[PDB]
Design a protein around this ligand. Structure first.
Ligand code: ANP
Ligand code: ANP
Ligand code: FX9
Ligand code: FX9
Ligand code: MG
Ligand code: MG
Ligand code: MG
Ligand code: MG
Lengths: 258, 258
């Protein structure tokens, strides 16, 4: 009989498509040696042929999608003024209020892209023709209870369109084309949320809303935010989102502790 | 005569290749209106035709280079254990000691890639054939005095090879092919530093060194780290590195305050 510790160890080495039944009579040392050999060969194959990181490759694929659909690629600060959080309407009695990683006195690691996107929409409206279409992909940070769907350090896609054409129908069409392009099953639940079963892939919004005024925004808009690691978790059928994270423990979902 | 404040404003709107002499008799309001029109059209052109962010595009170009030369693409945590800094030999009497952005009690924003790359070299040596070739591109953070060559939030390329072939000659060849591929003039000064005039583009190293033992490393290695914003600063002839940063004030080196 395998111990709980022994099966924890074998699960770390098990990949979702592996056709190995641990429940078999063979001893731990044999099962472990078999999985070690498979995971080493998986890494050798990546090293020999493709060599691209899941998270980076997904970011490049998403970037190509939105650039081709006419969205401007934004790269804005990750370390943002703490005042952006309050101006987002976030204070006591909101969950996000307590999830913020603070740096020094006046700064924090961004938990969301909306502040910087708001600022870019306002400034670019003075230069660019209607409608204004932008997106950003990059790190975001939230303090979280241990979860199989939550990382404290994750990667967010955010996209926003401002001006004409900002209808719910057009928003659902962007989401639908995007996730069909990636090959990720979903349902849109209606603000609106893009779900994979019980897992939230995205929350999306249709403006205007009263908050827009604080940011100097006075036009209709549509937008959404997606976690890339949740997308990888669904696409690759990982049982825990840690396999998709920036990590020293997993490479493209393969254990690095061999 | 233009005030210092007025010329500060016009310089924000001036692009390096602009053939406009501010020294001309025309009044501030006219010069400003002329530059505003040029910068707006520069942004319209980006929005119409390419739409890619300088920093992201450079990252993708560098990624393609190293992947094609056989380096594995790494994406590891940006928020790292504070213990990695001490184990790097960094304490009082080192500059970097005081430059660290600390988060909570046991963590910090990484100021360097060497800790995570060291850990990846050690773990991948159990799976991959010799030599082991990896690279990473991503955010790094250092507290800095105001500088025209320094950002507090920047982007670092790090690459490292471990095992056979780790000679100084092979290291200089990687650097030389890389910067000739990007079109960036340089000189190698000899550890070794890759300089553009007085601007340091890279510091590079040849192991083994005694520090390797703390990280479980016992093979020869070569590697280097490059700041992407310094590369963009040289390539685009920006007078201040802020034009290349993650920013809300500049898009591809064009002022967003129009
Ligand atoms: N801690 C996290 N780890 C991974 N992805 C996250 C995390 N927090 C948010 N996301 C993703 O980022 C998207 C935009 O943020 P948001 O809509 O605020 O998520 P959320 O409301 O916190 N969903 P949830 O925390 O699961 O109840 C979400 O739809 C998720 O896909
Ligand atoms: N604050 C910064 N802003 C932008 N790039 C940086 C910064 N700090 C380091 N870099 C880049 O990262 C590379 C690797 O880090 P490192 O060799 O430690 O730089 P460095 O020794 O601090 N050079 P310098 O700070 O200018 O005296 C450097 O060669 C720079 O190109
Ligand atoms: N509220 C989260 C997710 C989100 C939701 C809807 C619209 C956007 C955005 F992309 F338009 F910003 C983002 C965030 O701000 O990142
Ligand atoms: N000392 C810095 C830069 C550096 C220098 C030489 C080698 C590397 C590396 F890529 F091999 F890590 C990195 C850092 O650690 O990022
Ligand atoms: Mg949450
Ligand atoms: Mg949500
Ligand atoms: Mg320095
Ligand atoms: Mg140096």
């Amino acid at each position: 009989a395998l111990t709980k510790s022994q099966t924890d160890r074998l699960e770390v080495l098990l990949n979702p498509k592996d056709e190995i039944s641990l429940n078999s009579g063979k001893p731990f040392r044999e099962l472990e040696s078999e999985l070690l050999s498979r995971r080493k060969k998986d890494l050798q194959q990546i090293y020999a042929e493709e060599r691209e990181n899941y998270l980076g490759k997904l970011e490049r694929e998403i970037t190509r999608f939105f650039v081709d659909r006419g969205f401007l690629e934004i790269k804005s600060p990750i370390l943002i003024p703490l005042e952006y959080i309050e101006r987002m309407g976030i204070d006591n009695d909101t969950e996000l209020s307590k999830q913020i990683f603070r740096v020094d006195k006046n700064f924090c690691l961004r938990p969301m892209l909306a502040p910087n996107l708001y600022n870019y929409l306002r400034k670019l409206d003075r230069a660019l023709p209607d409608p204004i279409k932008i997106f950003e992909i990059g790190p975001c940070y939230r303090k979280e209870s241990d979860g199989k769907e939550h990382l404290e350090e994750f990667t967010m896609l955010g996209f926003q369109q401002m001006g004409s054409g900002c209808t719910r129908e057009n928003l659902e069409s962007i989401i639908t084309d995007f996730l069909n392009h990636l090959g990720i099953d979903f349902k849109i639940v209606g603000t609106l949320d893009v779900m994979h079963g019980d897992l939230e892939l995205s929350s999306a919004g249709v403006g205007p809303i009263p908050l827009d005024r604080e940011w100097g925004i006075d036009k209709p808009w549509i937008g959404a935010g997606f976690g890339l690691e949740r997308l990888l978790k669904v696409k690759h059928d990982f049982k825990n989102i840690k396999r998709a994270a920036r990590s020293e423990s997993y490479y493209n979902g393969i254990s690095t502790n061999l």
